[PDB]
Amino acid sequence: AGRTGRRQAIHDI
Amino acid sequence: AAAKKGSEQESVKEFLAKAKEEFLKKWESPQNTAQLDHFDRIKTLGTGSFGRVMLVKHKETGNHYAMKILDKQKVVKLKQIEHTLNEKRILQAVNFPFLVKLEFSFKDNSNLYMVMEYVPGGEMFSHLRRIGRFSEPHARFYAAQIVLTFEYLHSLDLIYRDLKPENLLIDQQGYIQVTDFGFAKRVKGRTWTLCGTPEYLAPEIILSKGYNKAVDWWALGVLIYEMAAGYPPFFADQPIQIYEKIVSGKVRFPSHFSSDLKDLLRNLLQVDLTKRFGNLKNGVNDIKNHKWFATTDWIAIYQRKVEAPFIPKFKGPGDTSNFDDYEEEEIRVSINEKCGKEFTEF
Ligand SMILES: [NH3+]CCc1cccnc1
């Protein structure tokens, strides 16, 4: 079970 | 076969030397090549934290473009600002068949704008989620284009840092176009920003270690796995659980993966940087010469001579049928200039 939709990139984290 | 591959090696070196000369000319002499009321805005093709990408139509020529709009107010964090300048300067200076072409850029009181060629076939992401997974020959065709694109970028000392299916568009010939250079950076040795997308982060990023272009080769392993399985190798509901799986040094493979594929992936998804393919004495050639790529004609791929696994349907220019729908929000330009000094170089 994991993320199936579009994934946001993180700029500082 | 041996001497054919060596000559092929010298020819790569020759190509990359010329490509660097071309890049540096544009890198040193980078602005304001259009304005907003030159375009009709049609439809939002994608949305993120800082803004959106819209299909627009140039009023004079009728040409269609993808316009990335960044809200200067939303771009408030230190590394969000620096990254935006990296993206514009890099995209104006590169030239490769699998990289999206920037046409115009400009700014107003409220926003920054980058106008790129419109690639109407949609994101690889959509196609992959719809079909489930790609067969290994299909995945390999896309992987080969990424290998060549990273060989080009890395030769220019550029790290890409956000490989994933959401950022790979399919063009009218069925080939890949990499977009979103928001995390790309010129790096002569190591860099230290904690950035990227959780599922695709190399262990050394997560562990707050100074890192180099090898993070892109790790991410290629994640991409190939996801293309061939339908899901990525480090898969959990929350980022912190993803990070624990990445650092563990463990990966499990579907039973339908070929042994050649598993061997390649074990050498890309390698936590030990002294052992990771792409990062050794022979560089990218350990990847290009791997058995899983034995059938790959690298020059034929670059020259776009290979028949693609599929061609997206197109109904005409401006067709947005291969993209998902997004909430539309009015583009409002303030009477007062916002953040003029932070974005002077843009
Ligand atoms: N993450 C890809 C966003 C996008 C969509 C359409 C055109 N260019 C970029």
* Residue B66 Cα distances to B40, B61, B200, B207, B232, angstroms: 11, 15, 25, 36, 28
Tokens in use for B304? 């776009």
How many beta-carbon pairs below 8 A join chains A and B?
Answer: 53
* Residue B94 Cα distances to B70, B161, B308, angstroms: 21, 16, 24
Q: Is B272 exposed, middle or buried (0-12, 13-18, 19+ CB in 10 A)?
A: exposed
Whether residue B115 contacts residue B103, with contact meaning beta carbons closer than 8 Å, is answered with yes
Domains and CATH numbers, chain B: 12-29+123-313 (1.10.510.10), 30-122+314-344 (3.30.200.20)
- CA separation for the pair B325, B124 (Å, rounded): 16
The residues with which B191 forms a beta bridge, in sequence order, are B211
- Is any atom of ligand 1 closer than 6 Å to the C-beta of B167? yes
- Resolution of the experimental model in angstroms, please? 1.6
Whether residue B310 contacts residue B90, with contact meaning beta carbons closer than 8 Å, is answered with no
- CA separation for the pair B121, B59 (Å, rounded): 23
Tokens in use for B28? 């040193």
Tokens in use for B89? 């300067």
Look up tokens 């899983």; give the residue.
Answer: B292
Q: What is the total residue count of chain A? A: 13
The residues of B assigned a catalytic role are 162
Q: Indicate which technique resolved this structure.
A: X-ray
* Residue B91 Cα distances to A1, A7, B23, B82, B87, angstroms: 36, 23, 10, 15, 6
CB-based contact B197 A1, cutoff 8 Å: no
Whether residue B162 contacts residue B182, with contact meaning beta carbons closer than 8 Å, is answered with yes
The residues with which B46 forms a beta bridge, in sequence order, are B53
Q: Which residue among B117, B179, B326 is best mutated to probe the pocket of ligand 1, counting the most ligand atoms within 8 A of its Cβ?
A: B179
